[model samples]
Target: QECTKFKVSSCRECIESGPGCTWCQKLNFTGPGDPDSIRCDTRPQLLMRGCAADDIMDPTSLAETQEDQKQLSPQKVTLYLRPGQAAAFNVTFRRAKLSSRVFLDHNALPDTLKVTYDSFCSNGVTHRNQPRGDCDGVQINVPITFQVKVTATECIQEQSFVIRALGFTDIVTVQVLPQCECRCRDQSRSLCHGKGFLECGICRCDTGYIGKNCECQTQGRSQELEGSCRKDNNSIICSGLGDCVCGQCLCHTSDVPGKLIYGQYCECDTINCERYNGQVCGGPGRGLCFCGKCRCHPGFEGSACQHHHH
Candidate 1:
């Protein structure tokens, strides 16, 4: 709305008008002699008025950890940072403590990025400078804490760097992704309803748009829709695994790493299934679980991959 009120014509001006505003880049979006301000609107209004989804310029900022490991966990990190914004993450270095151990080996980073260590004894009381009298007698995990910060900058290009701690072979790779452009532009369109943008198979909807394909609006719904998420009165809504949002069962990820729950009523999970010797799908050596069934691996065949195939 701010873009139209100010009669913004340029893509940069329309986008900079407000975070919720977007510009329609379709060639015929505005007829000849039409005011250029008509080309700018929020994403939903643009789609509702016949502007092509692919032509809507809506960019989003994102950052995430790429690697998962214990001790020096998250060995790889990435950021899609915008100007005036910042991103940060902690890389924990869990280690056994002794005399003269652990130091920040290499922390050279881009001017926009910086890292610092805040070591602490597992005793959890005195952080940074732990009193030697506290946990020195007992062998406990003395974590060499690390905090990496990525601040905003005019440089929209990519940046690559690394941080390494002493006495450990693991090195963390930090990659700062590009800014001002959506990576979804390279992907195929029409994957989501016109009210959203598709990125890496997921829909990031406009302010009021929602759903797996961004087809649903965030407006309120009646009781029947809410009732659909509950299979019966005797059981919890969404089988206690997920919350009912706009009549849909939004399931929760499993507590265990790499596991999740799904199904219309959240009745199924990736880890809850028949097990052999207290291991799910035979301890990952055999197979995995889907919809409450164990799918055995090659050369092993059983309900829980407990028996070998001939």
Candidate 2:
């Protein structure tokens, strides 16, 4: 009979503990995870030879382990993509470690958009892993969350990054802004004046007044309906409830749960609204609630005000 029970708290101790011993730097190594919390044999077994990357760790490596929370790239940015166009842009970031790696781990992403990344990722140290990817496949009206993880060379520690993709199609022509005669893609090189980057030759404006050159705005837009901004009343269009571009409507949204608002003018409550809310009858409701007030109620007349005929 041979004794297989062992305690390897340090790498040095494991290497000197005779033949059947292997070291694990992981905080835990056993049970339903790494075959067992501990391992030992009478054979000249190299430490951590059979343990998972996550199941093996050494005392020296533990001291170097850290929670990597730094990313060199901007945390959030808008990607203005066309209806049927696809473009690739590098989301540059940092891994920090002399030889660390990064990976894309999206729990859930919008279906309107698509993203591709390098399966095998690496920093500068050339390895068998591949490269990073791009978000070239789609359209997004609201801000979508994209997460990335960076790990150490040994992967003892990792950090997560958050990126928010935003914007919808329906443009204002590539004829460049009236104020600037330079190429739309040439304004400060981004046409956004340091506000945002170029996407598919279009400027994915930041969250505000909204411009192909990142229209500078004091306030940020809360909702971004999953639709194009179009012309409605021929004025501001969208009944002043949404934004219209290139004669298309891109409605605003509310934070209400299960409230699927899909209208060119962003005037539909869907959950509780009449049919003639929008420009249908030229009323304010437009088939949806107007400023939290019901319009076109059975008894109430004159555009819910009961004074003037709507």
Candidate 3:
């Protein structure tokens, strides 16, 4: 008898063996992401083609594999700014092959002043036009950053807008703060005396002192009354997990224990774990007991593995 190719959905033996196999008796090929083992058809034409031809037989394969390749869903990007600050820039949607729609919502601004205009540029040429409607997708060149504008109204508290680019779903935010006047009364011995402009609201203190008003003493100060505190000696404080930060201990892990201790301010955390007895103690095994002492895995927890099970 000539050997013929046939598909089996469910095979008792294959199913019992567990994952990487087909579950259907009519089609023995496993779908994408399937843990069950599937028996590949053993026919010349079908066998030579491998899983490619067998995938067609399984409906789940088509839905699972092909669906993942689809474009990413559309999402919005936010831009918030203060008066006199123009939110102007061009953004090209990178790796976005499909068309996308842009949405806008200006809070506190009147409908008349809440206007938006966009244009596309190709080969150093710009095309100016307004979006047709609220949800209209437009095709554009790759990595394109179009000009955007938001005019604040006198009565509006603050202008807020969102941009929804099609085929991608991620909110990119741009925030703008109100501008303030730079005025200094004592310009005789001040750094801003000769400078045209100085930053407003806060004063940049010397290396030892810090604070908005520059009133707090940063060096040679007594330790805080409460909370864990430590000072750096050779710039190797907290093992670089935090800054000497002016003779104050700013723990990076805080409550988290077993963090690495190194560096000028002690701000870096190190990974400590190893695999043993076919299991990871602190490494990939997450929370596993090593030796007799109970050490929780990276993603595990419990009092001797009992809490994890419970």
Top lDDT: which candidate number? 1
Q: 180-249 in candidate 1: lDDT tens per residue?
A: 5433333445656688775423456788876656666886644347677897866789998898876889
lDDT for model 3:
0.36
Best-to-worst order by TM-score is 1, 3, 2
Comparison by lDDT, 1 against 2, better one? 1
lDDT of 2 at 35: 27
* Candidate 3 lDDT by residue in tens digits, 69-110: 122222323433222233444444444454555443233434
Query: In lDDT terms, how accurate is model 2?
Result: 0.35
lDDT, each prediction: 0.63, 0.35, 0.36
* lDDT, ranked from best to worst: 1, 3, 2
Worst 10 residues of 3 by lDDT: 59-68
Candidate 1: TM-score? 0.37
Candidate 1 segments whose C-alpha is farther than 4 A from its true place: 1-56, 68-70, 98-106, 110-139, 142-147, 166-169, 183-310
Clashes of each: 0, 26, 52
**In model 2, where is the ten-residue run with the lowest total lDDT?**
172-181
Best by TM-score: 1
